[PDB]
Every structure is written in structure tokens, then in C-alpha cells.
Amino acid sequence: METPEPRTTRTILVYMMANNSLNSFASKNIESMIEGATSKNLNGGNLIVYYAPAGSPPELLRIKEENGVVKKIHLKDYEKQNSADPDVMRSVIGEVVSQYPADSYGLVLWSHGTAWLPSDYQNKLK
């Protein structure tokens, strides 16, 4: 069985859809997360990253200081999946909420954005 972590104050999931041209910046942003995610700064909370890069399958990561060093720990390696399918997003959120329960949850949605516009908006212009 998988045993959930002890409940805490806050769990934040960063959901990074980087299977696109933003790849290199997702990695620099994860670097910056690592710099900030000290035991003192996380204040008891959980920082979980769903990282969906170009060229390789998605991975679930926990960023946590252990023995004085912030580690980027591999939790799960997924098989190829559509990270833009709502049911996949919901499933990942469910994995995270179940394993890292908290009084408060936050979500960072990281990717390209175009407001409400249809993704085929160019076809609806002329």
C-alpha cells in the first residue's frame, strides 16, 4: 500500500506543460524553485512538480531539502500521456492530493496561454 505523508499546512502542485518551445525555461524555472524550496521556506509544506518535457515522458517530482540539500526527487515516471486531457490533469491532481494531504492547496499552471481563445483561433479570423 502507499501511505500518505503526514498532513501539513500547504501542498502546492506545479503542473508544467512543457512539451513545446518553452522547454528550456521550465528547467530554469525548476532551478529557481530548487533555490527557494529550503526547509525553512517551505515551512512544513509540500512542493510537487508534474513535469511534462519535450522528448521524454512526464514525471512527478518532489522538491524537498534533506540533509542540508534541496533534492529533486523522482516520485513517478509516467508513460506517454496527454497532459492537456482534463482527465489526465485530474488524475495527477488526485495522486498528489491523496499522497500529500494539507489544510491548503495551491496550483501553479505553467505553459503557453491564450486566454479563452480557441486553440484554432487562426482558423476563425478570415
Chain residues that interact with other proteins, rule: CB under 8 A: 9-10, 12, 17, 19-22, 25, 28-29, 32-33, 35-38, 40-45, 47, 52, 82-90, 93, 97, 104-119, 121-125
- In the complex, what is the shortest distance from the CB of residue 5 to other proteins, in angstroms, rounded to a whole number? 15
For residue 112, how many other CB atoms are within 10 A of its CB?
10
Cβ proximity to other proteins: between 1 and 101 the closer is: 101
Cβ proximity to other proteins: between 1 and 123 the closer is: 123
Where does residue 123 rank: exposed (0-12), middle (13-18), buried (19+ CB within 10 A)?
Answer: exposed
Q: How far apart are the first and last CA of the chain?
A: 56
Q: Please name every residue paired with 47 in a beta bridge, in sequence order, or none if there are none.
A: 12, 63
Cβ proximity to other proteins: between 1 and 6 the closer is: 6
Q: Please name every residue paired with 15 in a beta bridge, in sequence order, or none if there are none.
A: 50, 109
- In the complex, what is the shortest distance from the CB of residue 20 to other proteins, in angstroms, rounded to a whole number? 4
- In the complex, what is the shortest distance from the CB of residue 64 to other proteins, in angstroms, rounded to a whole number? 12
Tell me if 10 sits within 8 A of 105, measured CB to CB.
Answer: yes
Cβ proximity to other proteins: between 76 and 112 the closer is: 112
